[PDB]
Amino acid sequence: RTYLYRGRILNLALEGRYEIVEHKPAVAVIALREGRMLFVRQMRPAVGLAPLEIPAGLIEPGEDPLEAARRELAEETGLSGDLTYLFSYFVSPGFTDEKTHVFLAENLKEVEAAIEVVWMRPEEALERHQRGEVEFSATGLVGVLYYHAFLR
Amino acid sequence: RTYLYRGRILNLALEGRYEIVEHKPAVAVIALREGRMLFVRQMRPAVGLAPLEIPAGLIEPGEDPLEAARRELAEETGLSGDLTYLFSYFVSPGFTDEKTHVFLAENLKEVEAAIEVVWMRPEEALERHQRGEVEFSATGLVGVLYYHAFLR
Ligand SMILES: O=C[C@H](O)[C@H](O)[C@H](O)COP(=O)(O)O
Ligand SMILES: O=C[C@H](O)[C@H](O)[C@H](O)COP(=O)(O)O
Ligand SMILES: [Zn+2]
Ligand SMILES: [Zn+2]
Ligand SMILES: [Zn+2]
Ligand SMILES: [Zn+2]
Helix, strand or coil: CEEEECCCEEEEEEEEEEEEECCCCEEEEEEEEEEEEEEEEEEEEECCCCCEEEEEEEEECCHHHHHHHHHHHHHHHHHHEEEEEEEEEEECCECCEEEEEEEEEEEEEEEECCCCEEEHHHHHHHHHCCCCCCCEEEEHHHHHHHHHCCCC | EEEEEEECCEEEEEEEEEEEEEEEEEEEEEEHHHHEEEEEECCEEECCEEEECCCCECCCCCCHHHHHHHHEEEHHHHHEEEEEEEEEEEEECCCEECCEEEEEEEEEEECCCCCEEEEEEEHHHHHHHHCCCCEEEEHHHHHHHHHHCCCC
């Protein structure tokens, strides 16, 4: 494990063959309300566009998944609710170790009044994408599929 | 966009603030057969473990998503089938531009006889994970949720 770079949100290392990008673990929050899912959008310079996503972020030091989940929901949408741990996944285990912890939010309450809050019915997000009008981050897609799988 | 590294499967660059890992687009194949989903496992040095995944890989030069999908299914499981484009997503648009194209495979036929082929019912993969016995890559999770959403 030889490091070629130690950055702000990632490190670039080598393990002989493998190029490994170490990355901080992250969280994602799935929230449904009156048939609409809470998506969000922000400019993403890494991809040149603003894909459809759900409240998410990096787990800060001394903070655990749940806590991180709570903070992200509040900082990105100004809402708080009852969170339940659903599952987790490695974004791309082929080169990075970024692991995302997904949560479900219920009984959302306005606790606060350029990260666009986008309430939208999962069915329409799915249609817009199939029509090529909008893109998906892993979180957005997982939010939609999860919904179609367990929240209808 | 200043490059700090140009590697084999990724490039590390800077856009003033942003640390950007350019990555080749990838494909993923969802296949169900007699209630079992076709998962796969391989050692992943980037994460130190072998998460539950579905046939996937990098799109080679001159190859399009579908073609890549076909090749991966065949090289990793020795099967071929009827593939349909489902949707796509950016693994982690926060730092990388890796985009994955997900396909569904049907009417799988053995076209060929350390990437472990793991046939397993999505319900059990889901239970094992909830029990903390197994991890998920984004592809594996998407495969499971997609199944629970549209293939039951
Ligand atoms: O998460 C997997 C990504 O596709 C990585 O880029 C990984 O290195 C790809 O490896 P492979 O082609 O063996 O699936
Ligand atoms: O795909 C998003 C990943 O979490 C990236 O690491 C991204 O840089 C995180 O940014 P933020 O905390 O603003 O969501
Ligand atoms: Zn954030
Ligand atoms: Zn931070
Ligand atoms: Zn491959
Ligand atoms: Zn290759």
